[PDB]
């Protein structure tokens, strides 16, 4: 049962991160204010 729980955790974690990245990209497209945010798969860069 421990191994099954960890398997499901990995599965949903992976299935979830891609949707999060897509939503983040769509949100970042909203604004172009002076502090510029660059989003990448598995990475985020912040310029201040």
């Amino acid at each position: 049962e421990s191994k099954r729980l960890i398997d499901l955790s990995i599965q949903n974690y992976h299935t979830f991160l891609i949707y999060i990245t897509e939503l983040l990209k769509k949100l970042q497209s909203t604004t172009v204010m002076n502090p510029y945010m660059k989003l990448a798969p598995g990475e985020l860069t912040i310029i201040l």
């Binding site: 299935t15 949707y19 497209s29």
Partner: protein, 48 residues
């Protein structure tokens, strides 16, 4: 533009292990509402 980006955000995200976006549920509810409207009496071109 704001409504467009909000629609993009809604379309692009859903919970893991399900690939049906919430916009289909919204369209289903809109279809039900339109069916009720056409059922309703006192129809007007403004309803169309």
């Amino acid at each position: 533009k704001s409504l467009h980006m909000y629609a993009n955000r809604l379309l692009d995200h859903r919970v893991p292990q399900t690939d049906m976006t919430f916009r289909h549920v919204g369209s289903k509810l809109i279809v039900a509402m339109s069916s009720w409207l056409q059922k309703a009496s006192g129809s007007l071109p403004y309803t169309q």
